mmCIF file of C-alpha atoms and ligand atoms in Angstrom:
data_model
loop_
_atom_site.group_PDB
_atom_site.id
_atom_site.type_symbol
_atom_site.label_atom_id
_atom_site.label_comp_id
_atom_site.label_asym_id
_atom_site.label_seq_id
_atom_site.Cartn_x
_atom_site.Cartn_y
_atom_site.Cartn_z
ATOM 1 C CA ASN A 6 39.912 -63.405 -7.512
ATOM 2 C CA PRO A 7 36.163 -62.279 -7.468
ATOM 3 C CA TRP A 8 35.682 -64.644 -4.346
ATOM 4 C CA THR A 9 37.969 -62.917 -2.043
ATOM 5 C CA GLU A 10 35.434 -61.132 0.164
ATOM 6 C CA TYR A 11 32.857 -63.962 0.114
ATOM 7 C CA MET A 12 35.426 -66.582 0.974
ATOM 8 C CA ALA A 13 37.066 -64.489 3.735
ATOM 9 C CA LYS A 14 35.029 -66.130 6.468
ATOM 10 C CA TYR A 15 36.449 -69.657 5.375
ATOM 11 C CA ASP A 16 39.952 -68.375 6.088
ATOM 12 C CA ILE A 17 39.542 -70.139 9.713
ATOM 13 C CA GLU A 18 43.267 -69.346 10.609
ATOM 14 C CA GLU A 19 42.639 -65.806 10.077
ATOM 15 C CA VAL A 20 39.052 -65.406 11.405
ATOM 16 C CA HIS A 21 39.126 -67.746 14.114
ATOM 17 C CA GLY A 22 42.793 -68.031 14.949
ATOM 18 C CA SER A 23 42.631 -71.067 17.490
ATOM 19 C CA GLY A 24 41.658 -74.585 17.845
ATOM 20 C CA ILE A 25 38.277 -75.879 17.102
ATOM 21 C CA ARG A 26 37.956 -79.264 18.432
ATOM 22 C CA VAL A 27 40.121 -78.130 21.438
ATOM 23 C CA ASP A 28 40.470 -74.477 21.732
ATOM 24 C CA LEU A 29 43.103 -73.580 24.167
ATOM 25 C CA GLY A 30 44.916 -70.816 22.174
ATOM 26 C CA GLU A 31 45.793 -68.494 25.039
ATOM 27 C CA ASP A 32 47.097 -68.467 28.501
ATOM 28 C CA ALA A 33 46.016 -66.283 31.408
ATOM 29 C CA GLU A 34 46.938 -65.835 35.116
ATOM 30 C CA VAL A 35 44.778 -66.413 38.010
ATOM 31 C CA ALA A 36 46.324 -65.504 41.305
ATOM 32 C CA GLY A 37 49.525 -65.574 39.615
ATOM 33 C CA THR A 38 49.722 -68.904 38.060
ATOM 34 C CA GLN A 39 49.155 -69.224 34.244
ATOM 35 C CA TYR A 40 46.364 -71.535 32.993
ATOM 36 C CA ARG A 41 45.216 -72.331 29.432
ATOM 37 C CA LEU A 42 42.022 -71.183 27.981
ATOM 38 C CA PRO A 43 39.942 -70.820 24.807
ATOM 39 C CA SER A 44 40.573 -67.864 22.494
ATOM 40 C CA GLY A 45 39.004 -68.664 18.948
ATOM 41 C CA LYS A 46 37.352 -65.723 17.619
ATOM 42 C CA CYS A 47 34.227 -67.596 15.945
ATOM 43 C CA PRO A 48 31.492 -69.447 17.763
ATOM 44 C CA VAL A 49 31.570 -73.189 17.203
ATOM 45 C CA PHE A 50 28.044 -74.339 16.244
ATOM 46 C CA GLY A 51 26.993 -77.703 17.625
ATOM 47 C CA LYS A 52 29.933 -78.403 19.838
ATOM 48 C CA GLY A 53 29.575 -79.811 23.345
ATOM 49 C CA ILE A 54 31.578 -82.117 25.735
ATOM 50 C CA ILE A 55 30.521 -85.657 26.055
ATOM 51 C CA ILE A 56 31.313 -86.942 29.755
ATOM 52 C CA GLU A 57 32.273 -90.578 29.449
ATOM 53 C CA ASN A 58 31.101 -93.422 31.983
ATOM 54 C CA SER A 59 28.961 -90.763 33.416
ATOM 55 C CA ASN A 60 25.117 -90.105 33.198
ATOM 56 C CA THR A 61 25.927 -86.315 33.939
ATOM 57 C CA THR A 62 25.810 -83.744 31.158
ATOM 58 C CA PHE A 63 28.407 -81.181 30.735
ATOM 59 C CA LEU A 64 26.003 -78.186 31.290
ATOM 60 C CA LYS A 65 25.385 -79.284 34.867
ATOM 61 C CA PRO A 66 27.386 -77.314 37.426
ATOM 62 C CA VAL A 67 30.974 -78.265 38.291
ATOM 63 C CA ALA A 68 30.946 -80.380 41.307
ATOM 64 C CA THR A 69 31.038 -78.381 44.611
ATOM 65 C CA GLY A 70 30.278 -79.173 48.348
ATOM 66 C CA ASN A 71 30.819 -82.917 49.041
ATOM 67 C CA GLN A 72 30.346 -83.794 45.382
ATOM 68 C CA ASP A 73 33.270 -85.654 43.475
ATOM 69 C CA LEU A 74 34.349 -83.712 40.382
ATOM 70 C CA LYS A 75 33.779 -86.786 38.153
ATOM 71 C CA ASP A 76 30.105 -86.602 39.026
ATOM 72 C CA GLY A 77 29.536 -83.015 38.234
ATOM 73 C CA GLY A 78 29.385 -80.875 35.008
ATOM 74 C CA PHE A 79 31.523 -77.975 33.518
ATOM 75 C CA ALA A 80 29.111 -75.178 34.211
ATOM 76 C CA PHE A 81 29.311 -72.263 36.743
ATOM 77 C CA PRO A 82 27.820 -73.371 40.052
ATOM 78 C CA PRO A 83 24.900 -71.345 41.123
ATOM 79 C CA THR A 84 25.479 -68.038 42.588
ATOM 80 C CA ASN A 85 23.622 -65.268 44.396
ATOM 81 C CA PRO A 86 22.632 -63.214 42.502
ATOM 82 C CA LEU A 87 22.345 -66.055 39.881
ATOM 83 C CA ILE A 88 24.395 -65.373 37.087
ATOM 84 C CA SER A 89 24.775 -68.695 35.251
ATOM 85 C CA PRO A 90 22.754 -69.954 33.603
ATOM 86 C CA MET A 91 21.216 -66.739 32.357
ATOM 87 C CA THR A 92 18.616 -66.195 29.660
ATOM 88 C CA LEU A 93 19.225 -63.831 26.746
ATOM 89 C CA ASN A 94 16.337 -61.681 28.186
ATOM 90 C CA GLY A 95 18.157 -61.894 31.691
ATOM 91 C CA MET A 96 21.572 -60.912 30.176
ATOM 92 C CA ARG A 97 19.926 -58.001 28.232
ATOM 93 C CA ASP A 98 18.192 -56.723 31.515
ATOM 94 C CA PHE A 99 21.440 -57.167 33.757
ATOM 95 C CA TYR A 100 23.358 -54.994 31.227
ATOM 96 C CA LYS A 101 20.463 -52.511 30.380
ATOM 97 C CA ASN A 102 22.451 -49.529 31.379
ATOM 98 C CA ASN A 103 25.617 -50.413 29.437
ATOM 99 C CA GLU A 104 25.041 -49.548 25.700
ATOM 100 C CA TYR A 105 28.299 -51.188 24.788
ATOM 101 C CA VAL A 106 26.946 -54.607 25.853
ATOM 102 C CA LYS A 107 23.157 -54.485 26.035
ATOM 103 C CA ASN A 108 22.530 -54.984 22.324
ATOM 104 C CA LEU A 109 25.257 -57.507 21.418
ATOM 105 C CA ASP A 110 24.043 -60.472 19.647
ATOM 106 C CA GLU A 111 23.151 -63.692 21.697
ATOM 107 C CA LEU A 112 26.547 -65.448 21.178
ATOM 108 C CA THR A 113 28.840 -62.306 21.746
ATOM 109 C CA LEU A 114 26.641 -61.257 24.649
ATOM 110 C CA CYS A 115 27.090 -64.694 26.365
ATOM 111 C CA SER A 116 30.877 -64.454 25.752
ATOM 112 C CA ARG A 117 30.975 -60.960 27.226
ATOM 113 C CA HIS A 118 28.781 -62.068 30.163
ATOM 114 C CA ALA A 119 31.242 -65.041 31.107
ATOM 115 C CA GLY A 120 34.069 -62.750 30.469
ATOM 116 C CA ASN A 121 32.650 -60.357 33.276
ATOM 117 C CA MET A 122 33.267 -62.822 36.034
ATOM 118 C CA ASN A 123 36.855 -62.163 37.311
ATOM 119 C CA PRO A 124 38.319 -65.043 39.358
ATOM 120 C CA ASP A 125 40.871 -62.789 40.838
ATOM 121 C CA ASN A 126 38.523 -60.990 43.462
ATOM 122 C CA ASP A 127 41.968 -58.883 44.010
ATOM 123 C CA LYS A 128 42.970 -57.840 40.574
ATOM 124 C CA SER A 130 43.293 -60.708 35.788
ATOM 125 C CA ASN A 131 42.731 -61.406 32.075
ATOM 126 C CA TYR A 132 41.380 -65.148 32.706
ATOM 127 C CA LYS A 133 37.989 -65.099 31.065
ATOM 128 C CA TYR A 134 35.822 -68.347 31.248
ATOM 129 C CA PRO A 135 34.349 -69.701 27.970
ATOM 130 C CA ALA A 136 30.535 -70.474 27.735
ATOM 131 C CA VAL A 137 27.948 -72.242 25.946
ATOM 132 C CA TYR A 138 24.707 -70.544 24.436
ATOM 133 C CA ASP A 139 21.937 -73.050 24.077
ATOM 134 C CA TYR A 140 19.571 -71.949 21.357
ATOM 135 C CA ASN A 141 16.900 -74.135 22.428
ATOM 136 C CA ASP A 142 16.085 -72.284 25.937
ATOM 137 C CA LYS A 143 17.967 -69.182 24.898
ATOM 138 C CA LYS A 144 20.361 -69.613 27.884
ATOM 139 C CA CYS A 145 24.025 -68.724 28.376
ATOM 140 C CA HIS A 146 26.021 -71.270 30.562
ATOM 141 C CA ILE A 147 29.409 -69.960 31.785
ATOM 142 C CA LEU A 148 31.710 -72.768 31.720
ATOM 143 C CA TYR A 149 33.823 -72.914 34.955
ATOM 144 C CA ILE A 150 35.895 -75.961 33.504
ATOM 145 C CA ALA A 151 37.623 -74.884 30.332
ATOM 146 C CA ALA A 152 39.136 -78.097 29.657
ATOM 147 C CA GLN A 153 37.478 -79.884 26.554
ATOM 148 C CA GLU A 154 39.189 -83.298 26.328
ATOM 149 C CA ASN A 155 40.551 -85.611 28.861
ATOM 150 C CA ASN A 156 40.311 -89.181 27.330
ATOM 151 C CA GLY A 157 43.672 -91.016 27.128
ATOM 152 C CA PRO A 158 44.231 -94.554 27.592
ATOM 153 C CA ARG A 159 46.277 -94.098 30.895
ATOM 154 C CA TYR A 160 43.263 -93.369 33.088
ATOM 155 C CA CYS A 161 40.432 -93.326 30.752
ATOM 156 C CA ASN A 169 38.053 -94.842 37.396
ATOM 157 C CA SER A 170 37.732 -91.866 39.785
ATOM 158 C CA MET A 171 38.922 -90.174 36.699
ATOM 159 C CA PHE A 172 36.786 -87.443 35.021
ATOM 160 C CA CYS A 173 37.022 -88.506 31.379
ATOM 161 C CA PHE A 174 35.501 -86.367 28.642
ATOM 162 C CA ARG A 175 35.795 -85.639 24.765
ATOM 163 C CA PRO A 176 34.556 -82.647 22.634
ATOM 164 C CA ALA A 177 32.125 -83.593 19.758
ATOM 165 C CA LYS A 178 29.346 -82.727 17.690
ATOM 166 C CA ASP A 179 26.255 -84.675 18.573
ATOM 167 C CA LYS A 180 22.663 -84.517 17.872
ATOM 168 C CA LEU A 181 22.096 -83.792 21.590
ATOM 169 C CA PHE A 182 24.436 -80.751 20.981
ATOM 170 C CA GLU A 183 23.097 -79.294 17.838
ATOM 171 C CA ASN A 184 21.504 -76.216 19.516
ATOM 172 C CA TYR A 185 24.752 -75.664 21.757
ATOM 173 C CA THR A 186 27.134 -73.069 20.710
ATOM 174 C CA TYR A 187 30.750 -73.183 22.196
ATOM 175 C CA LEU A 188 32.184 -69.641 22.850
ATOM 176 C CA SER A 189 35.692 -68.415 23.986
ATOM 177 C CA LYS A 190 36.039 -65.135 25.611
ATOM 178 C CA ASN A 191 37.307 -63.729 22.068
ATOM 179 C CA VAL A 192 34.181 -64.290 20.226
ATOM 180 C CA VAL A 193 33.984 -61.431 17.791
ATOM 181 C CA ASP A 194 30.798 -59.064 17.581
ATOM 182 C CA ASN A 195 30.450 -59.416 14.054
ATOM 183 C CA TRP A 196 30.920 -63.232 13.730
ATOM 184 C CA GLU A 197 27.661 -63.284 11.471
ATOM 185 C CA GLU A 198 29.695 -61.346 8.902
ATOM 186 C CA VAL A 199 33.069 -62.958 9.435
ATOM 187 C CA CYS A 200 32.668 -66.633 10.661
ATOM 188 C CA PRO A 201 30.960 -69.503 9.090
ATOM 189 C CA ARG A 202 27.633 -70.875 10.286
ATOM 190 C CA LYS A 203 25.482 -72.249 7.431
ATOM 191 C CA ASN A 204 26.534 -75.020 4.999
ATOM 192 C CA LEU A 205 26.615 -74.179 1.415
ATOM 193 C CA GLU A 206 24.120 -76.451 -0.436
ATOM 194 C CA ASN A 207 24.918 -77.127 -4.221
ATOM 195 C CA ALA A 208 28.416 -75.743 -3.671
ATOM 196 C CA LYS A 209 31.832 -77.495 -3.330
ATOM 197 C CA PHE A 210 34.903 -75.531 -1.931
ATOM 198 C CA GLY A 211 37.783 -74.990 -4.451
ATOM 199 C CA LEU A 212 41.036 -73.178 -5.068
ATOM 200 C CA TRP A 213 41.010 -70.021 -7.205
ATOM 201 C CA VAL A 214 43.719 -70.496 -10.081
ATOM 202 C CA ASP A 215 44.252 -68.319 -12.952
ATOM 203 C CA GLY A 216 40.453 -67.167 -13.207
ATOM 204 C CA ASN A 217 38.795 -70.520 -12.666
ATOM 205 C CA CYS A 218 37.663 -72.390 -9.342
ATOM 206 C CA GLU A 219 39.731 -75.554 -9.567
ATOM 207 C CA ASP A 220 39.014 -78.798 -7.212
ATOM 208 C CA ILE A 221 40.907 -79.181 -3.819
ATOM 209 C CA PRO A 222 43.639 -81.314 -5.267
ATOM 210 C CA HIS A 223 44.040 -83.705 -2.372
ATOM 211 C CA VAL A 224 41.499 -84.647 -0.017
ATOM 212 C CA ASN A 225 40.888 -87.359 2.605
ATOM 213 C CA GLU A 226 37.831 -89.151 2.012
ATOM 214 C CA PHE A 227 35.754 -90.329 4.965
ATOM 215 C CA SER A 228 32.278 -92.057 4.416
ATOM 216 C CA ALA A 229 29.498 -90.181 5.936
ATOM 217 C CA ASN A 230 25.848 -91.068 5.842
ATOM 218 C CA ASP A 231 24.527 -87.453 5.833
ATOM 219 C CA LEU A 232 25.815 -83.913 6.216
ATOM 220 C CA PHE A 233 25.669 -84.070 9.963
ATOM 221 C CA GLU A 234 27.875 -87.053 10.148
ATOM 222 C CA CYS A 235 30.429 -85.154 7.646
ATOM 223 C CA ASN A 236 30.339 -82.246 9.815
ATOM 224 C CA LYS A 237 31.036 -84.314 13.004
ATOM 225 C CA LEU A 238 34.070 -85.935 11.150
ATOM 226 C CA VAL A 239 35.422 -82.577 10.114
ATOM 227 C CA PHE A 240 35.173 -81.281 13.562
ATOM 228 C CA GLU A 241 37.015 -84.432 14.876
ATOM 229 C CA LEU A 242 39.843 -83.873 12.609
ATOM 230 C CA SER A 243 40.008 -79.948 12.836
ATOM 231 C CA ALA A 244 42.476 -77.675 14.366
ATOM 232 C CA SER A 245 43.111 -78.672 17.954
ATOM 233 C CA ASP A 246 45.297 -77.247 20.729
ATOM 234 C CA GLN A 247 46.361 -80.411 22.511
ATOM 235 C CA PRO A 248 47.279 -83.887 21.271
ATOM 236 C CA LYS A 249 44.524 -86.238 20.821
ATOM 237 C CA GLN A 250 46.910 -88.905 22.639
ATOM 238 C CA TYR A 251 49.233 -87.262 25.026
ATOM 239 C CA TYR A 258 62.042 -92.480 29.447
ATOM 240 C CA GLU A 259 59.271 -89.845 29.716
ATOM 241 C CA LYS A 260 56.967 -92.681 30.130
ATOM 242 C CA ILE A 261 58.906 -93.881 33.315
ATOM 243 C CA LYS A 262 58.625 -90.629 34.791
ATOM 244 C CA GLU A 263 54.715 -90.536 33.874
ATOM 245 C CA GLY A 264 54.638 -93.693 36.112
ATOM 246 C CA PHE A 265 55.288 -91.589 39.293
ATOM 247 C CA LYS A 266 52.303 -89.358 38.779
ATOM 248 C CA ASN A 267 49.149 -89.587 40.883
ATOM 249 C CA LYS A 268 45.774 -90.025 39.053
ATOM 250 C CA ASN A 269 44.034 -87.732 41.306
ATOM 251 C CA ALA A 270 46.678 -84.921 40.798
ATOM 252 C CA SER A 271 46.631 -85.565 37.107
ATOM 253 C CA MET A 272 42.797 -85.096 37.069
ATOM 254 C CA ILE A 273 43.173 -81.847 38.567
ATOM 255 C CA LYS A 274 45.683 -80.854 36.020
ATOM 256 C CA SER A 275 43.461 -82.062 33.208
ATOM 257 C CA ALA A 276 40.572 -80.047 34.533
ATOM 258 C CA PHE A 277 42.211 -76.706 35.333
ATOM 259 C CA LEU A 278 44.885 -76.733 32.790
ATOM 260 C CA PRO A 279 47.837 -74.899 34.611
ATOM 261 C CA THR A 280 50.146 -73.964 31.552
ATOM 262 C CA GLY A 281 53.032 -75.467 33.524
ATOM 263 C CA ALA A 285 53.077 -75.575 25.904
ATOM 264 C CA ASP A 286 52.624 -73.386 22.902
ATOM 265 C CA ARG A 287 53.864 -76.156 20.744
ATOM 266 C CA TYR A 288 50.616 -77.454 21.110
ATOM 267 C CA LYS A 289 48.819 -74.344 19.790
ATOM 268 C CA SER A 290 47.116 -74.827 16.305
ATOM 269 C CA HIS A 291 46.401 -71.081 15.623
ATOM 270 C CA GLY A 292 43.559 -72.435 13.539
ATOM 271 C CA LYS A 293 45.555 -74.632 11.445
ATOM 272 C CA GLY A 294 44.017 -77.925 10.600
ATOM 273 C CA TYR A 295 41.323 -80.169 8.800
ATOM 274 C CA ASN A 296 38.787 -77.524 9.094
ATOM 275 C CA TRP A 297 36.795 -77.978 5.859
ATOM 276 C CA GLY A 298 34.781 -80.743 4.285
ATOM 277 C CA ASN A 299 33.217 -81.103 0.713
ATOM 278 C CA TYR A 300 30.249 -83.416 1.429
ATOM 279 C CA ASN A 301 29.184 -85.332 -1.658
ATOM 280 C CA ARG A 302 25.523 -86.312 -0.565
ATOM 281 C CA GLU A 303 25.433 -88.584 -3.578
ATOM 282 C CA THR A 304 28.401 -90.664 -3.109
ATOM 283 C CA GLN A 305 28.104 -90.119 0.812
ATOM 284 C CA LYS A 306 31.760 -88.945 0.868
ATOM 285 C CA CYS A 307 33.002 -86.153 3.216
ATOM 286 C CA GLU A 308 36.159 -85.078 1.506
ATOM 287 C CA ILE A 309 38.141 -83.579 4.384
ATOM 288 C CA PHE A 310 41.028 -81.068 3.706
ATOM 289 C CA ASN A 311 43.422 -78.767 5.508
ATOM 290 C CA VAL A 312 44.097 -75.873 3.050
ATOM 291 C CA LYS A 313 41.796 -72.827 2.944
ATOM 292 C CA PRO A 314 39.332 -72.769 0.185
ATOM 293 C CA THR A 315 39.265 -69.701 -1.941
ATOM 294 C CA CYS A 316 36.363 -69.960 -4.277
ATOM 295 C CA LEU A 317 33.302 -72.317 -4.759
ATOM 296 C CA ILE A 318 32.227 -74.627 -7.544
ATOM 297 C CA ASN A 319 28.417 -74.939 -8.362
ATOM 298 C CA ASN A 320 27.651 -78.666 -7.903
ATOM 299 C CA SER A 321 24.306 -80.081 -6.889
ATOM 300 C CA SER A 322 25.972 -83.210 -5.447
ATOM 301 C CA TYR A 323 27.730 -81.181 -2.855
ATOM 302 C CA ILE A 324 27.366 -79.323 0.501
ATOM 303 C CA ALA A 325 30.220 -77.247 1.706
ATOM 304 C CA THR A 326 30.819 -77.504 5.557
ATOM 305 C CA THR A 327 33.434 -76.306 8.132
ATOM 306 C CA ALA A 328 34.377 -77.585 11.642
ATOM 307 C CA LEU A 329 32.724 -74.242 12.808
ATOM 308 C CA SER A 330 29.526 -74.670 11.006
ATOM 309 C CA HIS A 331 26.229 -75.681 12.379
ATOM 310 C CA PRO A 332 25.689 -79.388 11.496
ATOM 311 C CA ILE A 333 22.406 -79.005 9.799
ATOM 312 C CA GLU A 334 21.546 -75.545 8.434
ATOM 313 C CA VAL A 335 22.026 -74.841 4.744
ATOM 314 C CA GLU A 336 21.888 -72.083 2.555
ATOM 315 C CA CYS B 1 34.123 -66.392 44.385
ATOM 316 C CA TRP B 2 33.828 -63.663 41.449
ATOM 317 C CA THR B 3 33.883 -59.957 40.932
ATOM 318 C CA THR B 4 32.466 -58.303 37.906
ATOM 319 C CA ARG B 5 34.862 -56.567 35.555
ATOM 320 C CA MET B 6 32.120 -54.065 34.084
ATOM 321 C CA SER B 7 30.814 -51.351 36.302
ATOM 322 C CA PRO B 8 29.063 -51.440 38.535
ATOM 323 C CA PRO B 9 31.743 -53.632 40.012
ATOM 324 C CA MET B 10 29.979 -56.289 42.098
ATOM 325 C CA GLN B 11 30.934 -59.231 44.278
ATOM 326 C CA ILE B 12 29.353 -62.583 43.156
ATOM 327 C CA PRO B 13 31.025 -64.521 46.096
HETATM 328 S S1 LIG C 401 36.558 -68.658 46.356
HETATM 329 C C1 LIG C 401 37.206 -70.121 45.705
HETATM 330 C C2 LIG C 401 37.608 -70.134 44.220
HETATM 331 C C3 LIG C 401 38.009 -68.986 43.681
HETATM 332 C C4 LIG C 401 38.194 -69.196 42.230
HETATM 333 C C5 LIG C 401 39.635 -68.750 41.697
HETATM 334 C C6 LIG C 401 37.283 -68.457 41.381
HETATM 335 N N1 LIG C 401 38.136 -70.649 42.100
HETATM 336 O O1 LIG C 401 37.780 -71.045 41.200
HETATM 337 C C7 LIG C 401 37.272 -71.132 43.284
HETATM 338 C C8 LIG C 401 35.781 -71.267 42.777
HETATM 339 C C9 LIG C 401 37.980 -72.417 43.685
#
């Protein structure tokens, strides 16, 4: 296969290795209790969190003081010295003596800066995820690592939210603690214009044999759909029902926000509907869940993935 | 509430 090196970055199980829609691929202890947290190795271009039934956007600081959780955002609260949000130039200055950090690209640097803040002032491997906003070149550490809480049961005083690609998020990038320093080389970013993903068989690039066709008005809408259907580390819809009726809603909110591990069955390890061939002429997003291993030249197509930016082409 | 992991270690409350 002459395509092996080129296509390696589309083997999302291998190169990313965790959920994309919801990335909760590892667990880590904080003060001796385990919590779920993001672990994907690739940046997720254009992902943010929509907070339902609230005007607050998710990069606002988590609620502190007398603020209710449902009225705040996900980000680090203000500190002294102020370490989140921090501009790219601010991070480079902060780490100017550390040759191992100060020249990282913006996304890895933001991931490493978030991973610098140990919540165990006394010991821990828990490392917050982060969002880098390309519009104002700011790294936001996310204090809340949850990404979806939107089931029918409570979604109220309830903090309800879901991950999405959205025009409002197109310059955001969702970063776990594990984002690799060479993601430009090994992870998707650009959509591939005039190209269709295929499978290499016996010296020829064949079509993906089974795809799931979702209509989509443009590439952005196709990327949004692939993201919605992609690898995910928690169920989209969570006698066990009788026992759920004894749970308290406010306690449940807290569990859904901080994610105490007290479920590897849920981990995708990157398996899912991570790819789509967008036919711009028929307005079909042809979505599939097996890794592609070659490209077909076809001027009607753009090849996208759940990790890819929703607009940029090459 | 946080302590930096990379030197120089620092309290950031
Ligand atoms: S200091 C209170 C506190 C410590 C830490 C573990 C980091 N938590 O997250 C809070 C903010 C509650």
